[PDB]
Symmetry: D2
Subunit: 99 residues, 4 copies
Amino acid sequence: MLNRVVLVGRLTKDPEYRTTPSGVSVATFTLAVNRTFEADFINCVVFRRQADNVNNYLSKGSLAGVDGRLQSRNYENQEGRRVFVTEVVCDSVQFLEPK
Amino acid sequence: MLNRVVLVGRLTKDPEYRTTPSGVSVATFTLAVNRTFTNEREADFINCVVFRRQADNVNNYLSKGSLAGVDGRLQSRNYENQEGRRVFVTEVVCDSVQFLE
Amino acid sequence: MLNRVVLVGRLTKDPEYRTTPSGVSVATFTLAVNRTFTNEREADFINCVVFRRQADNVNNYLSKGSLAGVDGRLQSRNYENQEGRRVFVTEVVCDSVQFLE
Amino acid sequence: MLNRVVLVGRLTKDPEYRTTPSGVSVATFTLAVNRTFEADFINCVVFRRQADNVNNYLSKGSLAGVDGRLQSRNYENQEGRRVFVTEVVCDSVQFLEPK
């Protein structure tokens, strides 16, 4: 079934590396995406070596584009509370501000 | 900037439909969207919200298991629950919902 | 940069299906996509192309009038026709096609 | 039915104004959109006063984002040849390079 999300926004902080529960390495970052009418704060996840591009080319405040799909998941946090999240899993990340 | 979501999936339950005392219709539903990649195929469960005439239409025509398309924007919001914990919410706010069955 | 198209519509004709002598499957079809805005409602007619296993699937399951979803990219190309005129082509190259019926 | 296209690219030339066959005024421009693997050249159309934003903020080479729908149409050109086109009709245009 169809599942596509496209965003352009600015990173709220420097990107990071994490490993998924299965031991898969990813890059993560949060985009502040301005509305056309205020902003939304969207957590993005990048698999494969694109994670290295993300962690080297992007920093806090960088403009980035993402083309990906929405994925849901949940987990129990440190305090023992179940957190439910919806994240953008990136098919590609575009570095719109190279200089 | 840019913020666009397009999904096709099936509602997990009958939509929930209410009218604020101000008169704005609101409908919510969760879209189950099967993945194309083959884990064994899993699904994602996306919480959707729609307003006004689109919400009226959703209530009149969609139910549990209905196939639907949504065209919308990803929105985040924050709230404090009754236990005092800050809860972060991500939802798709639908500009339109298409009835595919 | 970014280039993403998502459509849901009905095929105007049976897909056309061929295999290059190199062995790559190719399917083409035109998607009729009804407009949401009310002119009297009109439709847009988008030429789609798909390759490899997706093309095989399109040939096996889709026909004239079938409801389908496409997830893809807009591509432009140029050609000279037999009368010597340069023809500009815009097509959707499909990353996947979903069968909605 | 669903019909959505999202692009980021650079204008190939300065934007223009045109009026449709029914006398409706629009802005037009062409985006060069790089591929992730070369570019595609996509004609965009903007209705309403957003046409004025487009013709003042964007110029040749400007980075722009568009969120819109694909529309088909055809017409007979000057030489009397029927031309078939598919254009992006913009719900919004994002001016990604303000400075």
